[PDB]
Design a protein around this motif. Structure first.
Motif, mmCIF file in Angstrom:
data_model
loop_
_atom_site.group_PDB
_atom_site.id
_atom_site.type_symbol
_atom_site.label_atom_id
_atom_site.label_comp_id
_atom_site.label_asym_id
_atom_site.label_seq_id
_atom_site.Cartn_x
_atom_site.Cartn_y
_atom_site.Cartn_z
ATOM 1 N N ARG A 251 -3.833 -55.667 -10.605
ATOM 2 C CA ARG A 251 -3.375 -54.584 -11.496
ATOM 3 C C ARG A 251 -3.821 -53.192 -11.070
ATOM 4 O O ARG A 251 -3.366 -52.193 -11.650
ATOM 5 C CB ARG A 251 -3.847 -54.863 -12.925
ATOM 6 C CG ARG A 251 -3.196 -56.097 -13.495
ATOM 7 C CD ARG A 251 -3.411 -56.203 -14.984
ATOM 8 N NE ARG A 251 -3.332 -57.582 -15.425
ATOM 9 C CZ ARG A 251 -3.655 -57.999 -16.646
ATOM 10 N NH1 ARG A 251 -4.060 -57.132 -17.565
ATOM 11 N NH2 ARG A 251 -3.562 -59.286 -16.953
ATOM 12 N N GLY A 252 -4.732 -53.110 -10.091
ATOM 13 C CA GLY A 252 -5.107 -51.819 -9.524
ATOM 14 C C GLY A 252 -6.091 -50.985 -10.337
ATOM 15 O O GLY A 252 -6.173 -49.782 -10.145
ATOM 16 N N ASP A 253 -6.860 -51.617 -11.212
ATOM 17 C CA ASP A 253 -7.964 -50.942 -11.907
ATOM 18 C C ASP A 253 -8.899 -51.989 -12.417
ATOM 19 O O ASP A 253 -8.519 -53.156 -12.530
ATOM 20 C CB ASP A 253 -7.451 -50.110 -13.110
ATOM 21 C CG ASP A 253 -8.448 -49.005 -13.563
ATOM 22 O OD1 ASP A 253 -9.572 -48.886 -13.004
ATOM 23 O OD2 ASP A 253 -8.100 -48.245 -14.492
ATOM 24 N N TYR A 254 -10.116 -51.566 -12.751
ATOM 25 C CA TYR A 254 -11.083 -52.394 -13.430
ATOM 26 C C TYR A 254 -10.619 -52.766 -14.836
ATOM 27 O O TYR A 254 -9.856 -52.011 -15.430
ATOM 28 C CB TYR A 254 -12.440 -51.663 -13.458
ATOM 29 C CG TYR A 254 -13.043 -51.602 -12.064
ATOM 30 C CD1 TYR A 254 -13.561 -52.773 -11.453
ATOM 31 C CD2 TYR A 254 -13.042 -50.416 -11.326
ATOM 32 C CE1 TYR A 254 -14.079 -52.743 -10.153
ATOM 33 C CE2 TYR A 254 -13.583 -50.370 -10.037
ATOM 34 C CZ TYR A 254 -14.095 -51.548 -9.466
ATOM 35 O OH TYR A 254 -14.622 -51.533 -8.220
ATOM 36 N N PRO A 255 -11.099 -53.900 -15.383
ATOM 37 C CA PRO A 255 -10.797 -54.241 -16.788
ATOM 38 C C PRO A 255 -11.295 -53.176 -17.783
ATOM 39 O O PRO A 255 -12.280 -52.499 -17.526
ATOM 40 C CB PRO A 255 -11.593 -55.519 -17.036
ATOM 41 C CG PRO A 255 -11.931 -56.083 -15.677
ATOM 42 C CD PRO A 255 -11.983 -54.897 -14.744
ATOM 43 N N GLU A 256 -10.591 -53.048 -18.911
ATOM 44 C CA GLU A 256 -10.821 -52.012 -19.912
ATOM 45 C C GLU A 256 -12.261 -51.944 -20.400
ATOM 46 O O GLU A 256 -12.857 -50.865 -20.442
ATOM 47 C CB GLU A 256 -9.890 -52.294 -21.119
ATOM 48 C CG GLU A 256 -10.151 -51.406 -22.342
ATOM 49 C CD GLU A 256 -9.414 -51.894 -23.584
ATOM 50 O OE1 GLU A 256 -8.560 -52.814 -23.457
ATOM 51 O OE2 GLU A 256 -9.710 -51.354 -24.676
ATOM 52 N N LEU A 257 -12.824 -53.076 -20.805
ATOM 53 C CA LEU A 257 -14.200 -53.046 -21.338
ATOM 54 C C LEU A 257 -15.297 -52.821 -20.261
ATOM 55 O O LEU A 257 -16.397 -52.332 -20.572
ATOM 56 C CB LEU A 257 -14.498 -54.287 -22.174
ATOM 57 C CG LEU A 257 -13.557 -54.621 -23.345
ATOM 58 C CD1 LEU A 257 -14.213 -55.670 -24.213
ATOM 59 C CD2 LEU A 257 -13.237 -53.378 -24.160
ATOM 60 N N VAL A 258 -14.974 -53.160 -19.007
ATOM 61 C CA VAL A 258 -15.853 -52.827 -17.876
ATOM 62 C C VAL A 258 -15.919 -51.312 -17.727
ATOM 63 O O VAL A 258 -17.015 -50.765 -17.595
ATOM 64 C CB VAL A 258 -15.425 -53.500 -16.559
ATOM 65 C CG1 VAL A 258 -16.245 -52.928 -15.364
ATOM 66 C CG2 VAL A 258 -15.635 -55.014 -16.667
ATOM 67 N N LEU A 259 -14.772 -50.641 -17.807
ATOM 68 C CA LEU A 259 -14.742 -49.178 -17.702
ATOM 69 C C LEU A 259 -15.450 -48.514 -18.877
ATOM 70 O O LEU A 259 -16.183 -47.538 -18.701
ATOM 71 C CB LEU A 259 -13.318 -48.649 -17.524
ATOM 72 C CG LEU A 259 -12.589 -48.984 -16.220
ATOM 73 C CD1 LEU A 259 -11.057 -48.760 -16.339
ATOM 74 C CD2 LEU A 259 -13.163 -48.217 -15.003
ATOM 75 N N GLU A 260 -15.285 -49.081 -20.065
ATOM 76 C CA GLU A 260 -16.007 -48.587 -21.233
ATOM 77 C C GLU A 260 -17.527 -48.575 -20.979
ATOM 78 O O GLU A 260 -18.186 -47.543 -21.139
ATOM 79 C CB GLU A 260 -15.646 -49.417 -22.467
ATOM 80 C CG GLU A 260 -16.205 -48.884 -23.774
ATOM 81 C CD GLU A 260 -15.280 -49.199 -24.948
ATOM 82 O OE1 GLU A 260 -15.776 -49.754 -25.957
ATOM 83 O OE2 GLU A 260 -14.052 -48.920 -24.840
ATOM 84 N N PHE A 261 -18.063 -49.710 -20.540
ATOM 85 C CA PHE A 261 -19.475 -49.819 -20.186
ATOM 86 C C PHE A 261 -19.905 -49.057 -18.910
ATOM 87 O O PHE A 261 -20.962 -48.415 -18.891
ATOM 88 C CB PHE A 261 -19.854 -51.308 -20.143
ATOM 89 C CG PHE A 261 -21.206 -51.595 -19.549
ATOM 90 C CD1 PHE A 261 -22.370 -51.221 -20.207
ATOM 91 C CD2 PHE A 261 -21.310 -52.290 -18.338
ATOM 92 C CE1 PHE A 261 -23.629 -51.500 -19.657
ATOM 93 C CE2 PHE A 261 -22.558 -52.570 -17.788
ATOM 94 C CZ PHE A 261 -23.712 -52.167 -18.448
ATOM 95 N N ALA A 262 -19.087 -49.080 -17.859
ATOM 96 C CA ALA A 262 -19.589 -48.765 -16.511
ATOM 97 C C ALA A 262 -18.939 -47.596 -15.756
ATOM 98 O O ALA A 262 -19.273 -47.362 -14.582
ATOM 99 C CB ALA A 262 -19.551 -50.042 -15.646
#
Ligand SMILES: OC[C@H]1NNC[C@@H](O)[C@@H]1O
Ligand SMILES: [Ca+2]
Length: 438
Positions: A251-262
């Motif tokens: 999908r070309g990006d990190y998962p949503e909750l990973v980005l929220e945290f990291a």
């Protein structure tokens, strides 16, 4: 009866530093696991990979065991510093010779090699240059992978870039429990990102060099259940399981909750690398051992584990066979990879050799049977599972636990190096011969 598809690949798995010993034989460079385990306080009982299962000498015997059990595939890894002692540049022919002999022997015996390019023994020389923290490792790893493809790609047709890149990044660089033993969250997320970039460069080179093989990547996975009637389970799956990596790849990006945290910990312009990270893969390998009860917890990652009164292995891991079915269903549902393998499943128990000369590991038979049964189910419901690999062929060096945890279907007496096939190995061989459960 639970019969698997025709040509389904029953395997066993090992890793170079866990079984080989002789880390510095025949011109090999030091690895980060050599230097990490020789640092006091890092590994239980001061254990190291100096001798391990002595597979470096006993490789023919071990393969003869795989042959005698009728196991159809062997997943093993290559020690990068045996091949390129400084990590890049010089190639060590004796390192290639070691794996050439294993490869030719397997093929002679009708056993399919699955090669893990990186199972955690980074050359120490590259760690001095920042290891997985340095963007340049995408280049170093691509050069290493190219050497392997050029040397072995005529015979080996099934390749895995990385084993458990979550563990490598987070246990290695955040928790500090594995080599290189760091505790820096910004470094750990740069390692996540660089593992992806290196993985994609290696696949890119694979397409240029081995125009008949298949290549994939292996992830660790837990089965997370919420302690009550949630989002913490969502986070754990996205962070600790295949999505941390598959979301970039597919999908070309990190998962949503990973980005929220990291997000703050990732490079500022990390999206610049995503289109390259989307390099097409041939299969996903999923490792699975355990389930976890999880609940939200203020000031933790905001997640803590809840202990459950369930059968556990010697690791303290809860035995939750339905987890393997779940993760297989979930991977098809989320990313629909064209092929999946279970590249590791197994258990550690306090094995003892009985007076009768045998290892009566009924607990391990029960664990394997149940998980094979759940894998079977996934197949009936359309998951393209092509194979299943028992971790491990042999009791071996279990990282920071040292020799204190035995995962083999073959017992290793470390004082003599005697191998004693356990009840679970005999049992598994019957499964393989029958192509399933009865
Ligand atoms: O902890 C058991 C196994 N997990 N996956 C990777 C292997 O190297 C481990 O021994
Ligand atoms: Ca030593």
């Amino acid at each position: 009866v639970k019969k698997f598809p025709e040509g389904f690949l029953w395997g066993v798995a090992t890793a170079s530093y866990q079984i080989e010993g002789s880390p510095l034989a025949d011109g090999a460079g030091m690895s980060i696991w050599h230097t990490f385990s020789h640092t006091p306080g890092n590994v239980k009982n001061g254990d190291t990979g100096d001798v391990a299962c002595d597979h470096y000498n006993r490789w023919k015997e071990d393969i003869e065991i795989i042959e005698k059990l009728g196991v159809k595939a062997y997943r093993f890894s290559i020690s990068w510093p045996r091949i390129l002692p400084e990590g890049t540049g010089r190639v060590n022919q004796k390192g290639l010779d070691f794996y050439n002999r294993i490869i030719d022997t397997l093929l002679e015996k009708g056993i399919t090699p699955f090669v893990t390019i990186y199972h955690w023994d980074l050359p120490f020389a590259l760690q001095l240059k920042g290891g997985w923290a340095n963007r340049e490792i995408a280049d170093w790893f691509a050069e290493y992978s190219r050497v392997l493809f050029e040397n072995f790609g005529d015979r080996v047709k099934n390749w895995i870039t990385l084993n458990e890149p979550w563990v490598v990044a987070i246990v290695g660089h955040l928790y500090g429990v594995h080599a290189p033993g760091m505790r820096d969250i910004y470094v750990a997320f740069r390692a996540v990102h660089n593992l992806l970039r290196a993985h994609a460069r290696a696949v890119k080179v694979f397409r240029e060099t081995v125009k008949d093989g298949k290549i994939g990547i292996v992830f660790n996975n837990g089965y997370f259940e919420p302690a009550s009637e949630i989002r913490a389970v969502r986070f754990m799956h996205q962070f600790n399981n295949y999505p941390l990596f598959l979301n970039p790849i597919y999908r070309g990006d990190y998962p949503e909750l990973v980005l929220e945290f990291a997000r703050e910990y990732l490079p500022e312009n990390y999206k610049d690398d995503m289109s390259e990270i989307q390099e097409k893969i041939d299969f996903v390998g999923l490792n699975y051992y355990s389930g976890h009860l999880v609940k939200f917890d203020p000031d933790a990652a905001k997640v803590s584990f809840v202990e459950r009164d369930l059968p556990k292995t010697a690791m303290g891991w809860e035995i939750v066979p339905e987890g393997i079915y779940w993760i297989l269903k979930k991977v098809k549902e989320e990313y629909n990879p064209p092929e999946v393998y279970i590249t590791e499943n197994g258990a550690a128990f306090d094995d003892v050799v009985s007076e009768d000369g045998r290892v009566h590991d009924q607990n391990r038979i029960d664990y394997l049977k149940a998980h094979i049964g759940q894998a079977w189910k996934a197949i009936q419901e359309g998951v393209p599972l092509k194979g299943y690999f028992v971790w491990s062929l042999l009791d071996n060096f279990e990282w920071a636990e040292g020799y204190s945890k035995r995962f083999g279907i073959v017992y290793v007496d470390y004082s003599t190096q005697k191998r004693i096939v356990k009840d679970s190995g005999y049992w598994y061989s019957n499964v393989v011969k029958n192509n399933g459960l009865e």
